[PDB]
């Protein structure tokens, strides 16, 4: 369910971001999406380990 969260970015669908913006802004948008989903995955892996 975390896939549909914007994480403060413009859109949650990645293809819309890559087909809608220039790479000068797409770089920071993907930065936001990467850090949000990476934090979520870290939390899930810690829960699975416990």
């Amino acid at each position: 369910k975390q896939l549909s969260s914007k994480f403060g970015a413009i859109s949650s669908v990645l293809n819309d971001i890559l087909s809608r913006l220039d790479p000068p802004e797409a770089e920071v948008q993907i930065d936001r999406l990467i850090t949000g989903r990476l934090q979520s995955l870290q939390t899930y892996v810690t829960q699975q380990l416990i």
């Binding site: 859109s11 293809n15 819309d16 087909s19």
Partner: protein, 49 residues
Amino acid sequence: FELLHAPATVCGPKKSTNLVKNKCVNFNFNGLTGTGVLTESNKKFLPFQ
């Protein structure tokens, strides 16, 4: 502009292309860009969706 989930009524100039079935391709249906196979569905829609 606005990107509401609605029937798009103003769109850029792009020509149509014939459908392909049972081959997984990348498509573009009114700003909905996705990659997958296309086939006839068992589902049914009300005539507004």
